Design a protein around this nucleic acid. Structure first.
Lengths: 122, 173, 215, 37
RNA sequence: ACGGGAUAAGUGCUGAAAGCAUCUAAGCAUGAAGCCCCCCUCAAGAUGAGAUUUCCCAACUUCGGUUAUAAGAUCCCUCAA
RNA sequence: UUUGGCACCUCGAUGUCGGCUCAUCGCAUCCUGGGGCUGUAGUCGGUCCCAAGGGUUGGGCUGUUCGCCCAUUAAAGCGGUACGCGAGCUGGGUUCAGAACGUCGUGAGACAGUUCGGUCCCUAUCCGUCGUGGGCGUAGGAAAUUUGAGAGGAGCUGUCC
RNA sequence: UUAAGUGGAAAAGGAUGUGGCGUUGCCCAGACAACUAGGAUGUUGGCUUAGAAGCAGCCAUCAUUUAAAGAGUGCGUAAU
């Protein structure tokens, strides 16, 4: 349940560490995003070196939220922190590695490259 | 009105049954039932329907020519009928018969169906040229316009359903 | 076609095909009978009339609604029925497929039927404009003395009055509401219950009317 | 269709009629097709 | 995101006046989230007084009217969906 | 919908700008365009009909109606409605007593040029404006079981496969 | 003798309005008829202008075929 102004840790190696969300893409008035949605965000904390630099305006996909999803069989999955992954506007990542587990519903938005690179999809 | 003064209007082999405000006209292909008017009068001499107008007003001078052309059209369509012809200019633009109805394929996701009506007969000559035959001029004109309004002619290539003698302003864009 | 009356019992859930979870309202539709046919030649509209839950026979000097009065007894005497607690009329059925006195049974609905469900909603009492309508509150700090009131209610010297239908506080609650396009999940002939996917209006043990959906 | 308070024949084949209480002009080219309003 | 009617701008067909042509004057078609018909309350307060089970009779009694006596309601009492 | 006139009430008082909350008389319309015609290839442009049927965003920046960028979205009027709404709310603006700077003034002081500080009342009645009851009715006694005229009200929009 | 709800709201241009006389001037060799039957020509002759032979724009703007027709009324036209 990610809205404007929240901070998400970045779960890849593109050089960002922290990101602040600016908009939730979608419709007019869409307030909150969750696992699988694409946000546009600023980098507030970068890693020295690295492709993406501080002050950049990127878009990301949300993997991992703290208030996670309900699935169709009435089971749920929650995580312990909100994380994201910076993407390349063709749903490819900008980094090359993904750290941490990642929800299964990323396959429904065709983020196959993210789902492959991750240590186990949950 | 020279039209209302062309009020000979001779049936060839057709009966003309006045019934007051309404006329029946029966020939080879009869059953033409029209309520014409009240202001105009008419008469049958021997084999000649004459229509008279009263009072020489403007409105009567309209309705003279109208009722005359209506009657002439009725008995002439009872005798010989009317036929309207149109043609398909397109690539893969084809139509054919489906019993009594017509089926066209003009580049949609679906073929268009034209359900035939009474007193109306289609004929697909070379799967590009269609003729409609009927006994009333209004019916063939209306159903010609209805089938040609499915695909009007194009400005650039002229593709569509056009009439047989219809000029199309071909533009070069 | 196909209506029936029930008491809403409560809500549970059921696991469907390939393990999909389905939330479910169980509705007990026990002992319906056709009390009357109304016709276009006697009443001017075709309908049937169903009573639902049977109550006790008329008893001299009884105070409550547990016992029928004489008119209710005489009405349920024309069909060979006991007096019933609730009676409603159904207009969507075909009146020729029914017989006065016959039982309307739960298995007239099959699983997969899409239904409309009518009930009277819960009931909440005098509520204000934040809960009753969707109105938004004033600031809760910065000196505000405006928290849960409605705003202005009109303009000024033009229209020196308040327009009808203005969304003020008042009594919130029990109106009749139907939901459309719910569906039957399973029908249980032995317990005489229907399972409806979804939730239906009204409190527990309150009357519901099920009809076959139109759209 | 040009809709203007001053309808005038432009080409010599444009002609002026009245349909449904309005003044129109009809040429054979559809650029000279006008209506008073 | 009903699907029916009637329609706007428009497209037509037939068709004269205006002895031709022309969507129009008479006719006939078509034509839009707009206009009118399948959710909800009142709904004889629609002070003009809509439609579908029981009960009804005095002892007199200008059967008015009095006690009555009659049909179902209430007061009161235990409550809550 | 900035000026002219006033003076045509109000010096026995008609509360001033923004903002919030709530609308809506209700109209030359941004979106959908719903449709359509062309000095309309799709994409545009332009016009017509239709519409206020329905929709018509969150932030950074001010002193205020003025603006300006960021990021979205199918899209970001018209104001009479007392520049709609303070007996519904705020008091940032302006302006009351303090104080200071520039400037003008011999001076007391002024400007409106800046600047920091600064009290906004009311139990709702003749009345007009949402919800919920008692009775004048009531025409067989009376009582338990349903009209559908409309007084009617609810308008509900749209994007990607 | 009228026909906007003018009644019960004037306006600049644009079309066809009740007509109407004061008109004025057009034809049984047949009034506007429409009908459709003739469409020309040495002759673009000339400067011939992107040729253009109704049409860069200046005519040089002459006999016709026929009861009748233009160095072609004109529709046009890259020209036909």
């Amino acid at each position: 349940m990610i809205q404007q102004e929240t901070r998400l840790k970045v779960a890849d190696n593109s050089g960002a560490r922290e990101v602040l969300t600016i908009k939730v893409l979608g419709g007019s008035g869409r307030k909150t995003a969750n696992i699988g949605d694409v946000i546009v965000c600023t980098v507030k904390n970068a890693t020295p070196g690295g492709v993406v630099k501080k002050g950049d305006v990127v878009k990301a996909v949300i993997v991992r939220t703290k208030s996670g999803v309900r699935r169709n069989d009435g089971s749920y999955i929650k995580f312990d922190e909100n994380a994201c992954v910076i993407i390349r506007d063709d749903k490819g990542p900008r980094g090359t590695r993904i750290f941490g587990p990642v929800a299964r519903e990323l396959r429904e938005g065709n983020f196959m490259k993210i789902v492959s690179l991750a240590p186990e999809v949950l | 009105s020279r039209v209302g003064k062309k009020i000979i209007d001779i049936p060839s082999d057709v009966t003309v049954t006045f019934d007051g405000n309404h006329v029946t006209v029966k020939g080879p292909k009869g059953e033409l039932s029209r309520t014409l008017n009240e202001r105009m009068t008419f008469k049958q001499e021997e084999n000649t329907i004459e229509v008279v107008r009263p009072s020489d007003s403007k409105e009567d001078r309209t309705n003279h020519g109208t009722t005359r052309a209506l009657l002439n059209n009725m008995v002439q369509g009872v005798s010989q009928g009317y036929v309207k012809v149109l043609e398909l200019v397109g690539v893969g633009y084809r139509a054919q018969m489906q019993g009594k109805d017509l089926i066209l394929n003009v580049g949609y996701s679906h073929p268009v169906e034209i359900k035939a009506e009474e007193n109306i007969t289609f004929s697909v000559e070379k799967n590009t040229v269609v003729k409609v035959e009927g006994i009333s001029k209004e019916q063939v004109g209306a159903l010609a316009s209805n089938i040609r309004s499915v695909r009007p002619p194009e400005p650039y290539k002229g593709k569509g359903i056009r009439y047989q003698g219809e000029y199309v302003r071909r533009k070069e864009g | 076609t196909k209506g029936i009356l029930g008491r809403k019992i409560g809500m549970t859930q059921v696991f469907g095909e390939n393990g999909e979870l389905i939330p479910v309202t169980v509705v007990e539709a026990k002992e319906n009978v056709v009390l009357q046919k109304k016709t276009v030649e006697v009443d001017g509209y075709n309908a049937i009339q169903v009573g639902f839950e049977d109550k006790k026979a008329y008893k001299k000097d009884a105070k409550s609604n547990k016992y029928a009065n004489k008119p209710a007894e005489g009405h349920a005497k024309k069909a060979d029925a006991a007096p019933k607690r609730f009676i409603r009329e159904f207009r969507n059925v075909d009146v020729d497929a029914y017989e006065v006195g016959q039982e309307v049974s739960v298995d007239t609905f099959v699983a997969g039927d899409v239904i409309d469900v009518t009930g009277v909603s819960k009931g909440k009492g005098f509520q204000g404009a934040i809960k009753r309508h969707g109105q938004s509150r004033g600031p809760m700090s910065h000196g505000s003395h405006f928290h849960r009131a409605p705003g202005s209610v009109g303009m000024a010297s033009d229209a020196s009055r308040v327009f009808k239908g203005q969304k003020m506080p008042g009594r919130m609650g029990g109106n009749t509401v139907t939901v459309q396009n719910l569906e039957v999940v399973q029908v249980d002939t032995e317990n005489k219950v229907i399972l409806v996917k979804g939730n239906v209006p009204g409190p527990k043990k309150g009357l519901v009317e099920i009809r076959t959906s139109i759209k | 269709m040009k809709v203007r308070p001053s309808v005038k024949p432009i080409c010599e084949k444009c002609k002026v009629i009245k349909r449904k209480g309005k003044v129109m002009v009809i040429c054979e080219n559809p650029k000279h097709k006008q209506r008073q309003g």
